Symmetry: C2
Subunit: 222 residues, 2 copies
């Protein structure tokens, strides 16, 4: 879980613009890694938004810069602040949001002219079937990755003891077309392979077989 979170960051870093004197919004900031990074690369103002109080306490403990503020808030509830941001970021968060269209409308408004919108979601191929796991035989070999219901843009629920995880499946089309119809230009679309530091690692070998993540960089056009 932390292994492929490093695989996300490696590709995401190469998408990032220069942060000097930029105003940054981080949707689903967690422990505030992107907010810290932005600050120490010269951002004038960073807002980190997350739902978990536990995570924001750890974020504020890890953040020294007076440039960064944190707020407990749902991503669907972000404030309308027209033209306030140079860049909006979101790492592994938007596949938990029901209307990606609403998020794009709000990000568009909140961004200045030629503002940046860079995000990563769990891949449509990862979420399509719903089981979010390998197809296995009797001995337990991962035979292949199952894909089903690809055009059923609906909730995907998974069950653990005491937890209910709720995600929303969307197609590659929907992510790209939603950005385009909302006035964004597509700069990059990447499906990350494992980071070159951990490409040898035995557990990372199944990650070449199906994509786990979708990363997209987009620019506001008026």
């Amino acid at each position: 879980e932390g292994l492929k979170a490093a695989g996300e960051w490696h590709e995401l870093k190469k998408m990032l613009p220069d942060f000097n004197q930029k105003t940054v919004l981080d949707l689903g900031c967690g422990f505030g890694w992107h907010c810290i990074y932005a600050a120490e690369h010269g951002a004038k103002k960073v807002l980190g938004i997350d739902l978990s109080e536990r995570m924001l306490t750890e974020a504020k403990r890890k953040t020294t810069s007076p440039v960064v503020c944190y707020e407990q808030k749902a991503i669907e509830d972000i404030a309308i602040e027209p033209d306030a941001y140079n860049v909006v970021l979101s790492s592994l968060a938007l596949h938990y949001i029901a209307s990606f269209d609403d998020i794009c409308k709000k990000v568009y408004i909140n961004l200045k002219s030629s503002g940046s919108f860079i995000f990563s979601v769990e891949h449509p191929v990862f979420t399509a079937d719903g089981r979010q796991d390998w197809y296995t035989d009797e001995t337990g070999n991962k035979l292949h990755w199952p894909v089903d219901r690809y055009f059923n843009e609906s909730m995907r629920t998974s069950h653990f003891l005491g937890e209910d995880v709720q995600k929303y499946h969307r197609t590659v089309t929907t992510y790209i077309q939603t950005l385009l119809k909302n006035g964004f230009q597509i700069n990059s679309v990447i499906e990350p392979e494992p980071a070159p530091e951990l490409k040898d690692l035995p557990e990372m070998q199944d990650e070449y077989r199906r994509p786990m993540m979708l990363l997209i960089s987009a620019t506001k056009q008026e």
Copy 2:
């Protein structure tokens, strides 16, 4: 599959009026006839097969449209000559999509479009190009494997090898981007018998792109 490809591709097509068009893998020439009657000043359609190009010239009336017997990878370098380049279900049979992009960029005018369709990476990844079935032949789900393994996919029939090249969604999009195209539209079509199972996995990938200078 073929008619379903057209329905969605038609929607991507620009105004053809006094546009110079190139159709790659033109088959029986459907796009070439379409463009000519929608006001194109000049159209060139190419195909490898002589049998299909015989039928193509047979069912074509307009003198705006010329045909040649030529493979896609051997298209002529003609700088700033075309307004629009089309390719329907053809580029997944070509090894270097980068090479096609380099030539199409050069052959297009400013703000000219490159519109194409291929078999979707999810259809081509595993290589078996078929459902996973149990012992009684229920179609269980569609199998994905070796997604980032970008190489040949061969299928065998009596008397023929079929050779396709598997590429990722990244590859198609990032290659267009690095060769100076702007992405205008990316669509994975659904259809409008055994079309019943087609809503379950994507079969085709359609991209519309514009030349940027």
